[PDB]
RNA sequence: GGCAGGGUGAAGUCCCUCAACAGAGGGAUGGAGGCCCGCUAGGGGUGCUGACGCGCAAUUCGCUCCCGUGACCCCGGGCUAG
RNA sequence: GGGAGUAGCAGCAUAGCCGGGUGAGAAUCCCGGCCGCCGUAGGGGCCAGGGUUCCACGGCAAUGUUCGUCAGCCGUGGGUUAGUCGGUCCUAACCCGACCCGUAACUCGGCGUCGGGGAAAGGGAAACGGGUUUAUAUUCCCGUACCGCGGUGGUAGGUGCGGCAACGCAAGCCCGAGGGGUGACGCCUCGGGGUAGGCGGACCGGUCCACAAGGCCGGCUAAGCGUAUAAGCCCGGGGAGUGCCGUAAUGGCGAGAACCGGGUGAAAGCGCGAAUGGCCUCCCGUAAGGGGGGUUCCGCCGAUCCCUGGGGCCCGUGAAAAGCCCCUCGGGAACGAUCCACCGCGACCGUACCGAGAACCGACACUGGUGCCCCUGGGUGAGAAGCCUAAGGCGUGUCGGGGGAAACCCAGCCGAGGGAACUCGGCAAAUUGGCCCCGUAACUUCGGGAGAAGGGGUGCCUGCGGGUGUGUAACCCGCAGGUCGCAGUGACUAGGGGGGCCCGACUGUUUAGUAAAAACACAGGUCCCAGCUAGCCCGAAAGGGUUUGUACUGGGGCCGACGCCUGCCCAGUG
RNA sequence: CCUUGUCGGUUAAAUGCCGACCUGCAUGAAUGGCGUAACGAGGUCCCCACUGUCCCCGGCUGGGGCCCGGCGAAACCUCUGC
């Protein structure tokens, strides 16, 4: 069905690889941009006010 | 050959019905007979592709109909523009 | 609600787009600004099947060296010479302006405005007939039966399009229709709207019936034009 | 034969070197305080980020 | 077998070795013979091979000496005769 | 642990690991050996050997083929496939017609047939009249061709 | 990139004998099909309302049953986003 | 804490025993033998993915469904060598940037063009065999080769020939421009020639057997260089029809057949490479090592591997570009190679191991999935079926011991006389079964139904005959006689059949995980809009889909193969 | 709907099946009507054969269950329990 057996189909190419600008594994290899920092799409950094991750990285309050 | 009524549509066997089997058989029988060439006059013309007809002897290649080398409207246009 | 197939086609996705990289190039005549008053001569060097066209095409080589595709007429031979221009004879395969074409002649590949390359009467087995000439307009009978006026300087080619009788033979099988549709990426197989759910179609619902007239106004909004759009009448005769 | 990119190879090499136990002279120098650190990784248990 | 050799453009062949191994060798395929420009008939006196094979041959072992070596002889004679008859006036 | 020795000996003797033999009275000398050179010496001295392949006999099948040639083991209860699968359909016809055509040419070369009669016989054979050369000759005799 | 083996015998192409106003009868060739049998490989999931049901398994196992040159099965590269 | 020293450590592959050893300690680790399992996969090779799991030495606190002296566990040190293998080039579908347009704006939406990217199984220069290591090898060593660039020195040629011809030749150099070819292609089917592999006989050298014969093992040869026929195409001569030549089949001929001669042209084979190289074997104190021998002939089957030619189907037509060969032009110099011999140079990255009933994903050393992706000896046999078996692998689909083994359960075998009386319902089980001969109903869209139904036969031994073939080579097809058994497709393999009714025309698809169907689709029928700056559609706009398209077309609905048919009503809603 | 309608056939015995009749509660012509060869893991009635389905249950084979050595959980649990 939809569970354990389809999990076996996980030896294809990965959706995301390591990103050259920020060091995370969030670079989408078919589209050519990063889902975390925006590298490949934006000269500027991706940063949203509803997100916590950059504040956590800088030990900031929300 | 050894069929009373069916022809080329004996490949169908029981299926798809009378009207359709009859029509396929007739169209294909008239198409697969060797036709007269318009350049050399011999009966050596066969269909290559839809609308394209070729003579085996002289090598002449011409455009025509889907399942026959000529069409009625084509004959009329030939007659009229031969007049003028 | 949810969307219709006719609304998803407008987005331009792969499910709906034509595979024209598979085809032979477009078919256009020669520009006026390079055939002004010259009456060019060419030779037919190949006749070819085209997957996007419904008619066979021919490859013509001209004197300079330029090769081009034309829509092929019933009867044209490999090794035959054709003429394009105003002082071209009246012979099957030649292209002339309408002002030089007698009444009663069978014609194909007619321009809408002069110089536009060819628009009208292109399909396998079609022909148009020249009806009337005047100094301001030429009236032609199109295959739909309709009479239409053209500018007398519009270009047309003489004869009938090749590839007629195509529909004389039944398709017979579903698989043959599969291949015929795949060749041009047509939506196949086609669903019925009365066996869809109500979220999917203005027909639709578990009792499988249209519960309102299937004739729909010309001014209805998109998502609602299904059935018989702006019908003058319905039925047998 | 198995076709790695050079940069991925170098990152895997660092991950390989990182993976050993605390030296014994460190435990001695520290008087049994530092005896284990947070990056013991085994190839069947915890997978890395390629 | 590697995936590159699971590809049916490599014409595998079995060969027994001086050590008794019986191994598989792989080679690329040979291109077909030259054809006439007018008629599409095959040509004579023109050898078949890949580029590396053809570069180990001299010029005169690649085509016949006669003029228009890209045409069959009948079509060549047509061309020469037409030239002659147009060189009359 | 003698896995090293066994694996090296297999690679050197071009055999399998399960066909290597180590003397049970000299396991200690063999454990003392950690190099290919030392393993080679032990193989030269006979402490490590290659066992011979048993081999599968085919004498019973030989005797069966003999008897089948002289006419046994080929009755109705011994068959599992269709007669077409066992004989052929097209191969029989080919070998027949090739035989007939070869024979006809040989006759016409020996001088016994003229071209007209040869042609008519060629056509009869093509049409399927004879089914073998004895029938061909019986027809030539019945008629006046001999 | 791939699909053991076997069967049936469409069109097309003919041969022979007796006759010819018409015809009658006997022999072959050839290899089509969303054809047939088939746990070849592969794909699917009808019944026992079988085993299991803190399982080997958050949908599996066994027997039985269906397709198997096609609107067939699978792979690498891409496209469609609430 | 109780539940409890309980359940589970069975079911789909039931595997251990004897002797010896190590060690504190041995059902569970090592050696030998016996007995077993897999054997078109549990064997061999290798992607992705994983990342050191690879090797040697040393260990046993924890991990391992038991133990453990063992290990994919722990510790200490090691290990991946390339001009020729792959990536670095080309384009495909597709993506991006600039300019430009839109947006209040943008990291948003578009866009023809210009440029740039995009395939570790598509196109695409060049290397094979043997040895060596604990662990790498077409990468190191030995032997023998090839490619590109750059030089040196000679020659062909510039300024040369043989053939009626097809054609045969070393048959000039530099820079540019055109042209032709190759690259470069679908599905189905058939013949011809070869190879790997297999089989049979003879000879040599060995080995297993109270003997005995007989059985079993080994009996080899790469890239590269040189060398030519087959089909097919072609050139000369020749001159045909109450026809002649040919094929498995289709076919061919005054638009030039037969017949004589010839030219070009594949896969292969042959020679050199090449030998105490590899394999087998025989003597000596056995460390270095020592020593001498053999390496031969016929014949059969042959592919799913390689080459080459034919035929058939499409309302369906099955990539492109780089690169490479040839020809002709234009412009330059007087020299000078696509031939021979020699000399030098050839950067960067990957290269260990698994590749799955324990190295990948599924929380696990998970009967699932990824990958059956590529490949596989002998016998019976139609067969890559099932059964037995060689090679190779395993005894770890990782708890064992007792038992004439209590009831009861799971998975199997038999059952007297009856023969569906059981049950909602013949659920389940049984019956039939391969091949050859005979014979075969209704109904029918004349194709089928049909293997309808139904009936006979089948082993072993001894002899006779046929087909093709040169053949007491090899394959296939019949007859007669004798004889044994309850039984001869003796195991394995291997249909139970017939007659009425309803639905749906058929092949096909569906609710991943309680519904496979009468539901969907289908060919076909019929209605509607539309002459193109259209009709229908996306979007805030710019722009866009149908459109590389033009009424035998594109879009929108309903019915649903085929046959006989499809009546009346426009007051109402549209 | 009354309904196991009525008549006939099938059975020793028929709230079933088939064929006919027509007061069609509430059939009917492309929300198609009536038929239909071939096809169906579709639904349904009957006949031949066969059988442990049943009369009526019996005996065997392997694996568990039981005893022995070792590893060693969980669901559940107010206290208790004629
Ligand atoms: Zn980033
Ligand atoms: Zn002609
Ligand atoms: Zn030519």
GROMACS .gro file of C-alpha atoms and ligand atoms in nm, chain B residues 37 39-41 55 58 60, ligand 2:
model
    8
   99UNK     CA    1   0.141   0.490  -6.368
  101UNK     CA    2   0.447   0.852  -6.665
  102UNK     CA    3   0.510   0.508  -6.818
  103UNK     CA    4   0.165   0.348  -6.846
  117UNK     CA    5   0.601   0.326  -5.919
  120UNK     CA    6   1.019   0.377  -6.349
  122UNK     CA    7   0.814   0.792  -6.034
 1408LIG    ZN1    8   0.576   0.434  -6.423
   0.00000   0.00000   0.00000
